[PDB]
Amino acid sequence: MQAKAVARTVRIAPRKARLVMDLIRGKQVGEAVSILNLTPRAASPIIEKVLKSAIANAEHNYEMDANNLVISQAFVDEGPTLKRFRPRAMGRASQINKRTSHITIVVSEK
Template sequence: MEVKATAKTLRIQPRKARLVLDLIRGKDVEEAAAILKFLPNKGGYLVGKVLHSAVANAVNNNDLDESKLYVKACWVDEGITLKRFMPRAKGSASAIHKRTSHITVVVAEKE
């Protein structure tokens, strides 16, 4: 049985979030939470929230044992892009793209 949690429209670039997810893919939930807790960047905090939600879904909704859970899969999809403009020289403007992410974490129970 696998259980997932998704957080949508998080204000982090997908490329930066993928670096964090590569660190926890396939690890036990306790080990993954410890890794995310001590990461110095914003991605560690956001992915930690999604992981905690996936574990809570597994324990409360599906009656799985928390000590046997591991991160089966995790991925990032690109969300909407907020488009902003910054004034430049001679009356022109340049575009600024503020990217967002949809982060999904799937946990499963080891046999």
């Protein structure tokens, strides 16, 4: 049995979220929460909320036991990019990609 949660179009760059995901992928949900709580990165509180949302789903919707859950899938996909422009010297503008992420966690019983 699996429970999934997704955060779609979160304003954080995918590369930056994936640094943190790599810490928790395959870990037990107890450990993963700890890691996220003590990892000082912008992505940590966002990924913590998805992870906790997945556990809640596992308990509420599917009567899984939160003590026996493991992160079975964890990935970040590119959301749509907000395109912005930074003015540079000599009247030139240069693009800025304010990238967004779709953050998925799947928990499952061990």
